[PDB]
Amino acid sequence: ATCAVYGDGHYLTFDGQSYSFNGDCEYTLVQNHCGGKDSTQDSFRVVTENVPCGTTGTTCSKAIKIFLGGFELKLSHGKVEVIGTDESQEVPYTIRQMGIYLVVDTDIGLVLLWDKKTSIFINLSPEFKGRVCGLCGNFDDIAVNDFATRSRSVVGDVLEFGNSWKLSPSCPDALAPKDPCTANPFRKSWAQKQCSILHGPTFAACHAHVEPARYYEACVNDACACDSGGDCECFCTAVAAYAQACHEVGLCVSWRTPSICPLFCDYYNPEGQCEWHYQPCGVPCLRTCRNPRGDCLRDVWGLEGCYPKCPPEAPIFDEDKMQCVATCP
Amino acid sequence: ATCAVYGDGHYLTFDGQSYSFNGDCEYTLVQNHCGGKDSTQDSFRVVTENVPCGTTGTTCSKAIKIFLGGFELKLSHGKVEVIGTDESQEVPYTIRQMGIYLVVDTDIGLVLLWDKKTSIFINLSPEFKGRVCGLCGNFDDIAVNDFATRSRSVVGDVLEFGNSWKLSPSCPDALAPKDPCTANPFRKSWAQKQCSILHGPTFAACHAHVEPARYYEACVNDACACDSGGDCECFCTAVAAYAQACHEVGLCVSWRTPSICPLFCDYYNPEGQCEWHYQPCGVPCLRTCRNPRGDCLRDVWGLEGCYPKCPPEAPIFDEDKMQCVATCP
Ligand SMILES: [Ca+2]
Ligand SMILES: [Ca+2]
C-alpha cells in the first residue's frame, strides 16, 4: 500500500486505484480521526498546494505542509522551514536526505518521500487500516470503496470527489483536463521518442510483473503538457515514478544514461577525492553518526541517487558536513 | 582569429565581425583557391547543412561534410562516417574525441571542433592570410571588408551575402528572422532567469575583458526560440559558446552546477574504479598511445568536459578502449 502523487494529477491510492485529478487549491492527503473519531491518538494532517505550471491548465505540487500535532512544517524551494514552532513539545520529525529524496519520517508509522520538485510517496502502517480518510482513500484493501468523500459516502464521480476535499472555501470548483498532445501536436514526436524507453528492452523484466501502459500514457501526456522551460524535469519525474513503482516490488532496474535524464554526482566531491557514486538499487543500509556501523535500520523500499562511498579510512559517514568521519562526536 | 558558428545563426568571422543569418540549404564555410587561384596547394572545402528545428523558422547545423582533397567525411548523429573513400592516398584526418568536442585535425594547419549537437569552431593558420574565401570572410585582419562575396565584392547587405554562398541552385532565398521572444512571450521569464547567469558574479572576471551583452542577447533569443523538446541543449550550447569565447583569451571559468547544465562523467566508470573527473579549464596535455608520456603537444585552446584521470598504476591512457594501460602495443 503506497499513496503515490507525482507529475500532473497522477494519484494512486493505497488499495491500488489509479485516476487523475487537477485543481488549484489546498487539498488534504491523509487525515486522522475523520469525523471527530478521537481514538486516543494524535491527529496528523498532510496538505498540499497546487499552482498552474504551463499553459493548458495542468497542475503540479509546489509546496507541501505537514500538521503533526502542534507542529507545522513547510516544504518549498528544496528546503524545509519550521513554521508552527510548537512550545514545550518534542519534535517528532526526523528530516533526512537520501538519494534524490528528502525523506521525512514520523513516530507514528508514517513516512514521506519528496523528490524536491513535484513527486511525493506515502506509506502507512497496517494498524491504521480502516481508520484513515482523505484523498488517498480509506485504507481497507478494497478498490471499489476508495472513492469515499468527507461525508463517508463512496461516489463513482472523480471530479466531485476531488473537489470535496478542498480546504479553502473560496477557490472555485475544479474542471476536467484537456488533451495535452492535442494541445501541443508538434511535441508529439519528441514526446513519444523520449517516452518509448518504457517499452524498450530496459523494462523487459518489469513487463512481466506490472503493466506499463498506464505509465506510458502518463509519460506521453506529461511530455506533451510541459511547455515552459524545464521539460527535462517533466520527463525525468514521469520516468522515475515508474522506476520507483517497479522498485517497490523488489527488482532493481538501471536506466540513467548520460544522454537521457543525467545526474551529476561528482560536484559534491572535493578536490582530489572521489567518494560519490550512483546506485540504481539504493543502499540498503549505511553508517552515519546517528546509525552506528553495526546498526543498519533497513526501512527503505529501494531508492536511487548519488550516495557517498566512504573510503576504508573513516568508513563512517556524517550526513551533516557531507563527508566521512572516523569518529562521530 | 576563430570562426565560430553555434546555436541558431550565430557567426563570428576571423577578424572579429559578428552577425546573424538563417536559411535552409548547403553553405560553404571555408573555401580554398577561390576563383581558381591554384597557389600550388591542395583545395580544401567545408560545407554545412541547415534544417529547421522549431516552429518560428530558426535554423541549426545538423550535418557537416568536409571535402579535403579526394576525401569526403560525414558528421551526423554524434559519429563520423567516411563517404568519399579516396583510393591510393593517405588519410590526412586525425579524428579525436576530447572533452565534449569531437576534434578533427588536418595536416594543413586547419582544426575543427564539434560539440556533436550544433556548435562548430574553426581556427586557421596565419600563413593563409588574405587567400581564403567563404562565409567566414576573407582572412585579412580587417573587419570592414569581411563581407566579400563570391564575386570578390564587399557588400554591406547580410542576407544577400549569406544567400550568395549557397551550393544547391534550387533552394529558395533566405528570409529575415523574426523575434523569438515576441513569438513565445510565455517563455520570456524562464529564459531570462536561466540566461541571467551571464550577468551574475560567475563571469565577473570575464566582464572586464569581453562584453557579454551580445552573448546575453544570443542566450535570450536561443531560449525563446527553442520550442520543441530539448531546450536544455538550446541553453547549454548558448552558455558554452560564451564559455569557450572567454577561454580563448586565457582565463578559466567554472560554471557547471548539478542544477544548471549538468554533466554525467561517472557513467563511463566501470564497477569499483573512479578515474573520470570534470576539468573546466581542460587538460593542457595528457598521455596516450599516440602521444607518449614525455610528449604533450599542447595545441588546444582550452576545452571542457569529462576527462580520464589515470591512476598512478598504468598512468598512460589508450583512447581506444576508454581506459588507462601501462604499455601501449
Ligand atoms: Ca477502499
Ligand atoms: Ca575582412
XYZ file of C-alpha atoms and ligand atoms in Angstrom:
660
model
C 0.000 0.000 0.000
C 1.563 3.247 -1.213
C -0.155 6.561 -1.927
C 1.748 7.923 -4.931
C 1.318 11.513 -6.133
C 3.562 12.759 -8.929
C 3.657 14.821 -12.093
C 0.338 16.394 -13.056
C -2.566 14.807 -11.211
C -1.347 11.202 -11.053
C -2.772 9.660 -7.880
C -2.526 6.013 -6.819
C -4.474 5.028 -3.714
C -3.355 2.619 -1.001
C -5.528 -0.236 -2.281
C -4.275 0.157 -5.856
C -6.716 2.549 -7.525
C -5.416 4.920 -10.204
C -7.120 8.052 -11.521
C -6.445 11.675 -12.469
C -7.478 14.975 -10.903
C -6.376 18.588 -11.348
C -7.212 21.779 -9.496
C -5.866 24.957 -7.900
C -6.492 24.921 -4.135
C -5.291 23.243 -0.933
C -6.080 19.539 -0.544
C -5.738 17.208 2.436
C -3.921 13.994 1.534
C -4.258 11.918 4.718
C -6.453 12.923 7.659
C -6.713 11.211 11.040
C -9.784 10.979 13.277
C -12.056 11.892 10.376
C -15.474 12.837 11.694
C -14.104 13.575 15.156
C -13.304 9.918 15.906
C -10.684 10.591 18.566
C -9.378 7.032 19.002
C -6.899 8.070 21.731
C -4.366 9.023 19.065
C -2.773 12.276 17.962
C -4.326 13.833 14.867
C -1.929 14.194 11.927
C -2.747 16.035 8.707
C -0.797 16.493 5.468
C -1.833 19.157 2.955
C -0.587 20.199 -0.473
C -0.733 23.338 -2.610
C -1.328 23.266 -6.369
C -0.303 26.053 -8.755
C -0.564 26.198 -12.571
C 2.634 25.136 -14.367
C 2.174 25.506 -18.117
C -0.389 26.987 -20.481
C -3.020 24.249 -20.946
C -4.089 24.329 -17.291
C -2.070 21.426 -15.903
C -1.245 21.312 -12.201
C 1.727 20.297 -10.078
C 2.665 20.245 -6.412
C 4.675 23.316 -5.409
C 4.550 23.385 -1.595
C 3.624 20.705 0.941
C 2.699 21.465 4.555
C 2.531 18.905 7.370
C 0.465 19.368 10.543
C 1.794 16.813 13.042
C 0.250 17.602 16.414
C 1.105 21.155 17.384
C 3.912 21.383 14.827
C 3.787 22.744 11.283
C 6.342 22.170 8.523
C 6.901 23.860 5.164
C 8.420 22.268 2.052
C 9.371 24.604 -0.791
C 12.383 25.544 -2.923
C 14.131 22.301 -1.989
C 14.309 23.156 1.709
C 12.367 22.699 4.945
C 11.369 25.559 7.250
C 9.666 25.172 10.626
C 6.579 27.392 10.838
C 4.451 26.218 13.761
C 7.338 26.018 16.256
C 5.406 24.160 18.929
C 6.332 25.014 22.512
C 7.304 22.584 25.292
C 6.933 19.570 22.991
C 9.485 17.202 21.499
C 9.985 17.432 17.737
C 8.761 14.162 16.179
C 10.101 14.680 12.663
C 13.485 13.203 11.720
C 14.144 15.013 8.417
C 16.810 13.266 6.340
C 18.130 13.498 2.774
C 18.848 10.234 0.942
C 19.465 9.939 -2.783
C 17.206 12.333 -4.665
C 14.569 12.092 -1.935
C 14.092 14.330 1.108
C 12.798 11.646 3.452
C 10.703 12.852 6.392
C 9.846 10.215 8.994
C 7.407 10.355 11.904
C 6.983 8.395 15.132
C 3.528 7.023 14.251
C 4.495 4.760 11.366
C 4.155 7.486 8.722
C 6.923 8.067 6.167
C 7.108 10.663 3.392
C 9.367 10.756 0.337
C 9.958 14.010 -1.548
C 11.895 14.342 -4.805
C 12.086 18.103 -4.030
C 10.398 19.120 -7.313
C 6.914 17.591 -7.648
C 6.680 13.939 -6.585
C 5.630 12.524 -3.218
C 5.104 8.981 -1.900
C 3.299 7.973 1.298
C 3.417 4.679 3.192
C 1.188 3.899 6.165
C 1.437 1.299 8.898
C -1.053 -1.607 8.714
C -2.599 -0.967 12.151
C -4.223 2.226 10.811
C -6.338 0.148 8.414
C -9.940 1.286 8.091
C -9.436 4.465 10.139
C -7.974 6.900 7.577
C -9.888 9.446 5.493
C -8.530 11.675 2.757
C -7.681 11.938 -0.915
C -5.636 8.733 -0.593
C -8.861 6.815 0.066
C -9.868 4.678 3.014
C -7.209 2.103 3.907
C -9.367 -1.010 3.645
C -7.692 -3.174 0.938
C -10.799 -2.796 -1.265
C -10.516 -0.928 -4.562
C -14.255 -0.308 -5.055
C -14.973 1.842 -1.962
C -11.856 4.038 -2.069
C -13.940 6.903 -3.510
C -15.400 7.766 -0.095
C -15.764 11.508 0.463
C -15.815 13.614 3.631
C -19.470 12.616 4.083
C -18.286 8.978 4.368
C -20.062 8.152 1.098
C -18.414 6.442 -1.876
C -19.288 8.166 -5.162
C -18.137 6.967 -8.574
C -17.610 10.569 -9.675
C -13.975 11.669 -9.615
C -14.148 15.443 -10.116
C -16.717 15.848 -7.334
C -14.705 13.584 -5.030
C -11.556 15.605 -5.676
C -13.302 18.938 -5.160
C -14.930 17.729 -1.928
C -11.528 17.550 -0.174
C -10.615 21.215 -0.683
C -9.567 23.395 2.258
C -10.125 26.984 1.119
C -13.890 27.622 0.787
C -13.217 30.389 -1.763
C -11.311 28.564 -4.510
C -13.531 27.634 -7.483
C -14.524 24.117 -8.445
C -12.051 22.077 -10.467
C -12.660 21.349 -14.148
C -11.962 18.419 -16.435
C -8.492 18.461 -18.043
C -7.854 18.705 -21.769
C -5.645 16.600 -24.044
C -2.015 17.790 -23.781
C -0.941 16.074 -27.004
C -3.848 17.536 -28.964
C -2.953 20.914 -27.452
C 0.718 20.547 -28.486
C 0.818 18.251 -31.536
C 4.283 19.439 -32.592
C 5.679 17.977 -29.358
C 4.192 14.527 -30.031
C 7.134 13.125 -31.996
C 9.758 14.099 -29.422
C 7.469 13.057 -26.560
C 6.890 9.581 -27.990
C 10.560 9.154 -28.890
C 11.633 10.016 -25.349
C 8.938 8.005 -23.545
C 9.490 4.955 -25.778
C 12.203 3.820 -23.343
C 9.373 2.425 -21.205
C 8.521 -0.128 -23.908
C 12.179 -0.813 -24.693
C 14.345 -3.715 -23.576
C 15.315 -1.887 -20.370
C 11.971 -2.655 -18.688
C 11.602 -6.142 -20.180
C 11.921 -7.766 -16.752
C 9.350 -5.390 -15.260
C 6.960 -6.059 -18.156
C 6.178 -9.487 -16.696
C 5.133 -8.112 -13.292
C 3.489 -4.709 -13.825
C 1.715 -3.314 -16.870
C 3.381 -0.064 -18.032
C 0.575 1.038 -20.379
C -0.806 3.472 -17.803
C 2.675 4.802 -17.046
C 3.417 5.073 -20.774
C 0.284 7.173 -21.232
C 1.285 9.264 -18.218
C 4.743 9.902 -19.688
C 3.288 10.870 -23.067
C 0.745 13.243 -21.520
C 3.323 14.794 -19.186
C 5.779 15.419 -22.018
C 3.007 16.860 -24.195
C 1.740 19.198 -21.472
C 5.091 20.586 -20.289
C 5.533 23.727 -22.406
C 7.574 26.219 -20.382
C 11.274 25.688 -19.768
C 12.102 22.567 -17.792
C 10.727 19.713 -19.885
C 13.712 17.644 -18.745
C 12.222 17.613 -15.247
C 8.756 16.939 -16.692
C 10.172 13.767 -18.295
C 12.557 12.640 -15.547
C 9.780 12.723 -12.944
C 7.492 10.675 -15.191
C 10.159 8.021 -15.735
C 11.217 7.958 -12.075
C 7.619 7.357 -10.989
C 7.510 4.053 -12.868
C 11.064 3.303 -11.738
C 10.025 3.612 -8.088
C 6.846 1.621 -8.724
C 8.941 -1.206 -10.175
C 11.455 -0.973 -7.323
C 8.601 -1.363 -4.826
C 8.104 -4.954 -5.996
C 11.750 -5.756 -5.281
C 13.551 -5.652 -8.630
C 16.412 -3.296 -9.485
C 16.397 -1.532 -12.864
C 19.186 0.678 -14.231
C 18.066 3.246 -16.797
C 20.024 6.503 -16.393
C 22.351 7.358 -19.287
C 24.460 10.479 -19.953
C 22.060 11.323 -22.802
C 18.711 10.809 -21.012
C 17.973 12.175 -17.517
C 21.630 12.595 -16.494
C 22.972 13.014 -12.975
C 25.933 14.981 -11.617
C 27.256 13.040 -8.629
C 30.808 14.417 -8.922
C 30.034 18.026 -7.960
C 29.949 17.364 -4.212
C 33.365 15.700 -4.390
C 36.139 17.960 -3.050
C 39.434 18.256 -4.909
C 41.498 15.075 -5.089
C 38.912 12.756 -3.507
C 36.328 10.576 -5.265
C 33.742 9.010 -2.964
C 30.328 9.565 -4.612
C 28.701 7.037 -6.940
C 25.301 6.330 -8.477
C 23.407 3.336 -7.065
C 20.242 2.455 -9.028
C 19.039 -0.030 -6.408
C 19.767 2.263 -3.466
C 21.950 1.466 -0.468
C 20.064 -0.908 1.873
C 21.902 0.311 4.982
C 24.818 2.668 5.616
C 26.866 4.008 8.537
C 26.498 7.509 9.994
C 26.687 9.298 13.345
C 23.051 8.529 14.200
C 23.141 4.949 12.897
C 26.314 3.160 14.084
C 28.311 0.698 11.989
C 26.545 -2.321 13.467
C 23.073 -0.809 13.167
C 21.524 -0.617 9.702
C 17.773 0.081 10.078
C 16.930 -1.005 6.525
C 13.479 0.583 6.475
C 13.765 1.839 2.885
C 11.834 0.440 -0.077
C 14.568 0.971 -2.673
C 15.633 4.427 -3.845
C 18.169 5.897 -6.258
C 20.550 8.831 -6.412
C 24.074 9.932 -5.571
C 25.403 8.232 -2.452
C 28.764 8.654 -0.690
C 31.095 5.652 -0.838
C 33.275 6.212 2.207
C 36.919 5.104 1.903
C 38.260 2.321 4.142
C 39.778 5.111 6.230
C 36.934 6.800 8.132
C 34.244 4.480 6.713
C 31.521 6.202 8.753
C 29.520 8.991 7.147
C 28.417 12.166 8.924
C 25.425 13.468 6.880
C 25.997 16.937 8.404
C 29.161 18.001 6.552
C 28.532 15.616 3.614
C 31.776 13.811 4.445
C 33.030 10.609 6.055
C 34.467 10.841 9.577
C 36.166 8.085 11.562
C 34.638 9.095 14.914
C 31.316 10.867 15.439
C 31.376 13.256 18.462
C 41.156 34.562 -35.274
C 38.396 31.992 -34.790
C 35.364 31.353 -36.992
C 32.622 30.473 -34.501
C 29.285 29.007 -35.610
C 26.830 27.887 -32.940
C 23.183 27.835 -31.960
C 20.844 29.449 -34.479
C 22.719 31.611 -36.964
C 25.451 32.991 -34.697
C 28.521 33.596 -36.860
C 31.762 35.278 -35.785
C 34.320 35.911 -38.516
C 38.088 35.561 -38.224
C 38.672 39.313 -37.931
C 36.044 39.705 -35.203
C 32.807 40.515 -37.025
C 29.521 39.271 -35.565
C 26.175 38.983 -37.349
C 23.199 36.659 -37.810
C 21.952 34.638 -40.770
C 19.422 31.830 -41.195
C 18.488 29.628 -44.127
C 17.772 26.093 -45.327
C 20.410 24.984 -47.851
C 24.063 23.921 -48.068
C 26.668 26.601 -47.348
C 30.441 26.608 -47.799
C 32.251 27.782 -44.671
C 35.881 27.996 -45.832
C 36.949 27.617 -49.465
C 40.491 27.471 -50.827
C 41.718 28.735 -54.203
C 38.602 30.863 -54.618
C 38.316 31.998 -58.216
C 40.579 29.205 -59.438
C 43.700 30.653 -57.782
C 45.647 27.401 -57.625
C 48.566 28.581 -55.468
C 50.295 25.166 -55.601
C 48.182 23.985 -52.672
C 45.503 21.347 -52.230
C 41.946 22.676 -52.279
C 40.004 22.067 -49.057
C 36.299 22.780 -48.619
C 33.996 22.530 -45.596
C 30.217 22.585 -46.042
C 27.262 22.515 -43.664
C 23.600 21.526 -43.867
C 20.817 23.510 -42.188
C 17.417 22.068 -41.259
C 14.510 23.718 -39.395
C 14.487 22.997 -35.646
C 11.441 24.612 -34.054
C 8.284 26.358 -35.212
C 9.299 30.006 -35.751
C 11.703 29.164 -38.583
C 15.002 29.070 -36.703
C 17.906 27.073 -38.104
C 20.653 24.863 -36.708
C 23.511 22.767 -38.034
C 22.553 19.101 -38.380
C 25.248 17.575 -40.609
C 28.703 18.824 -41.594
C 30.650 17.477 -44.576
C 34.365 18.033 -45.214
C 35.986 17.812 -48.660
C 39.735 17.500 -48.037
C 41.377 16.647 -51.345
C 39.867 13.459 -52.709
C 38.364 12.505 -49.347
C 34.868 13.192 -48.031
C 33.708 12.989 -44.414
C 30.250 12.942 -42.836
C 29.326 14.207 -39.362
C 25.881 13.283 -38.049
C 24.249 11.573 -35.063
C 27.398 12.058 -32.989
C 29.539 9.886 -35.256
C 31.841 10.131 -38.270
C 31.429 8.057 -41.438
C 33.827 8.043 -44.385
C 31.951 8.615 -47.649
C 34.470 9.562 -50.335
C 36.926 6.746 -49.536
C 39.755 8.092 -51.662
C 41.948 5.472 -53.322
C 45.753 5.204 -53.164
C 46.026 8.280 -50.933
C 46.978 8.681 -47.288
C 44.189 9.750 -44.937
C 45.017 13.247 -43.632
C 42.364 13.479 -40.923
C 43.269 12.543 -37.341
C 39.790 12.331 -35.771
C 39.924 12.508 -31.973
C 37.423 12.952 -29.136
C 38.396 15.270 -26.271
C 36.004 16.574 -23.640
C 32.644 17.349 -25.216
C 34.310 18.128 -28.543
C 34.940 15.796 -31.486
C 38.194 17.369 -32.630
C 39.146 16.798 -36.270
C 42.633 17.947 -37.258
C 44.212 18.282 -40.698
C 47.780 18.463 -41.995
C 47.437 21.975 -43.459
C 47.026 23.934 -40.238
C 43.235 23.540 -40.132
C 41.492 22.391 -36.944
C 37.787 21.785 -36.330
C 35.914 21.482 -33.036
C 32.491 19.830 -32.888
C 30.254 19.674 -29.813
C 28.347 16.878 -31.635
C 24.990 18.710 -31.459
C 25.142 22.115 -33.183
C 28.301 24.118 -32.453
C 31.495 24.317 -34.503
C 34.714 26.340 -34.172
C 37.379 26.855 -36.842
C 40.966 28.057 -36.463
C 43.240 28.802 -39.411
C 46.996 29.141 -39.685
C 48.352 32.685 -40.208
C 50.138 31.900 -43.493
C 46.752 31.531 -45.232
C 46.020 35.218 -44.595
C 44.385 37.029 -47.497
C 43.844 33.865 -49.559
C 40.628 32.425 -48.070
C 37.081 32.960 -49.345
C 33.857 31.789 -47.752
C 31.173 32.569 -45.210
C 33.905 33.083 -42.597
C 35.084 36.153 -44.523
C 38.463 36.945 -46.016
C 41.298 36.425 -43.529
C 42.795 39.911 -43.684
C 42.574 41.265 -40.089
C 40.171 43.994 -41.280
C 36.589 43.993 -40.011
C 35.149 46.289 -42.706
C 35.831 44.151 -45.816
C 34.849 40.753 -44.386
C 31.526 40.936 -46.270
C 33.165 39.963 -49.572
C 31.012 37.635 -51.670
C 31.897 35.050 -54.317
C 32.235 37.913 -56.816
C 35.075 39.286 -54.633
C 32.938 42.324 -53.775
C 32.217 43.521 -50.237
C 28.532 44.373 -49.755
C 27.063 45.761 -46.542
C 23.962 43.612 -47.017
C 23.923 40.487 -44.856
C 21.017 38.447 -46.243
C 22.304 38.756 -49.813
C 25.840 37.890 -48.705
C 24.590 34.803 -46.883
C 22.433 33.665 -49.794
C 25.288 34.173 -52.273
C 27.287 31.308 -50.700
C 24.642 28.620 -51.248
C 25.508 25.353 -53.002
C 22.194 23.947 -54.239
C 20.855 26.182 -57.050
C 17.287 25.053 -56.276
C 16.852 26.057 -52.628
C 14.920 29.333 -52.217
C 16.387 32.587 -50.973
C 16.722 33.052 -47.227
C 14.431 35.423 -45.335
C 14.849 37.731 -42.369
C 14.276 36.065 -38.976
C 11.530 37.017 -36.548
C 11.677 37.803 -32.827
C 11.724 34.543 -30.820
C 10.723 36.227 -27.557
C 7.809 38.046 -29.181
C 6.817 34.719 -30.743
C 6.969 32.938 -27.354
C 6.306 35.560 -24.657
C 5.369 32.953 -22.039
C 8.935 31.611 -22.220
C 10.478 35.031 -21.524
C 10.514 34.763 -17.727
C 12.199 31.356 -17.643
C 14.557 32.351 -20.465
C 15.732 35.497 -18.678
C 16.019 33.698 -15.341
C 18.204 30.992 -16.871
C 20.367 33.296 -19.009
C 20.879 35.755 -16.130
C 23.884 33.664 -15.044
C 25.855 35.536 -17.715
C 25.443 38.809 -15.798
C 25.985 37.132 -12.427
C 29.114 37.051 -10.291
C 30.393 33.948 -12.104
C 31.524 35.955 -15.153
C 32.699 38.993 -13.175
C 36.321 38.388 -14.179
C 35.360 37.996 -17.840
C 33.279 41.189 -17.701
C 36.480 43.254 -17.681
C 37.843 41.689 -20.884
C 34.898 40.870 -23.169
C 31.447 42.426 -23.341
C 28.739 39.765 -22.811
C 25.804 41.902 -24.000
C 25.802 40.238 -27.420
C 26.088 36.786 -25.852
C 23.339 37.655 -23.359
C 21.049 38.609 -26.237
C 22.020 35.399 -28.030
C 21.149 33.310 -24.964
C 17.796 35.058 -24.544
C 16.883 34.627 -28.215
C 18.003 30.987 -28.266
C 15.974 30.129 -25.168
C 12.941 31.962 -26.564
C 13.132 30.222 -29.944
C 13.664 26.645 -28.730
C 10.118 25.256 -28.517
C 10.290 21.514 -29.169
C 11.750 19.138 -26.605
C 15.408 19.728 -25.826
C 15.545 23.286 -24.503
C 18.283 22.130 -22.122
C 20.571 21.702 -25.129
C 19.352 25.015 -26.573
C 20.556 26.718 -23.365
C 23.723 24.711 -22.695
C 25.057 25.434 -26.186
C 24.384 29.155 -25.771
C 26.233 29.269 -22.451
C 29.116 27.103 -23.683
C 29.660 29.419 -26.652
C 30.477 32.330 -24.346
C 32.432 29.976 -22.085
C 34.684 28.974 -24.985
C 34.981 32.589 -26.132
C 36.185 33.562 -22.656
C 38.547 30.577 -22.503
C 40.104 31.689 -25.799
C 41.558 34.745 -24.049
C 43.262 32.534 -21.471
C 41.089 32.649 -18.351
C 39.412 29.629 -16.758
C 35.788 29.924 -15.618
C 33.825 27.253 -13.735
C 30.056 27.444 -14.174
C 28.531 23.943 -14.302
C 26.282 23.052 -11.358
C 24.098 19.976 -10.729
C 21.043 22.212 -11.239
C 22.084 24.019 -14.452
C 23.574 22.218 -17.480
C 24.690 19.108 -15.561
C 27.201 16.512 -16.704
C 27.404 12.759 -16.106
C 31.098 11.867 -16.008
C 30.604 8.771 -13.826
C 28.760 6.631 -16.391
C 31.901 5.562 -18.257
C 33.491 4.409 -14.999
C 33.454 0.605 -14.647
C 32.499 -1.003 -11.344
C 34.855 -0.309 -8.450
C 37.082 2.208 -10.259
C 36.798 6.007 -10.276
C 39.045 7.757 -12.791
C 36.871 10.353 -14.585
C 36.576 13.968 -13.448
C 35.324 17.298 -14.779
C 38.002 19.847 -15.717
C 36.601 23.304 -16.572
C 39.938 24.580 -17.883
C 40.673 21.455 -19.917
C 43.767 19.273 -19.666
C 46.706 21.047 -21.365
C 48.475 17.788 -22.247
C 47.887 14.119 -21.439
C 49.477 10.723 -22.113
C 48.137 8.179 -24.613
C 49.408 5.559 -27.060
C 49.888 8.101 -29.860
C 51.344 10.815 -27.616
C 53.962 9.340 -25.240
C 54.440 10.416 -21.626
C 57.206 12.868 -22.498
C 55.361 14.349 -25.470
C 52.445 16.681 -24.756
C 51.581 18.579 -27.972
C 49.580 21.275 -26.177
C 47.869 22.594 -29.304
C 44.484 23.092 -27.620
C 42.924 26.466 -26.814
C 41.178 25.386 -23.606
C 38.219 23.000 -23.592
C 35.945 21.389 -21.011
C 34.308 18.039 -20.392
C 34.813 14.665 -18.746
C 38.442 13.565 -18.814
C 40.039 10.348 -17.519
C 42.347 10.739 -14.522
C 44.570 7.692 -14.851
C 45.739 6.092 -11.585
C 49.453 6.022 -10.717
C 49.381 2.413 -11.906
C 49.125 2.463 -15.712
C 49.161 6.281 -15.936
C 49.006 6.173 -19.745
C 45.628 6.417 -21.446
C 44.605 4.432 -24.524
C 41.722 6.444 -26.096
C 40.620 3.269 -27.937
C 39.135 1.265 -25.047
C 38.482 4.381 -22.906
C 40.865 3.015 -20.274
C 44.388 3.524 -18.951
C 47.042 0.979 -19.951
C 50.618 0.760 -18.692
C 52.101 -0.235 -22.069
C 50.708 0.646 -25.495
C 51.318 -2.130 -28.097
Ca -11.471 1.438 -0.393
Ca 37.864 41.441 -43.954
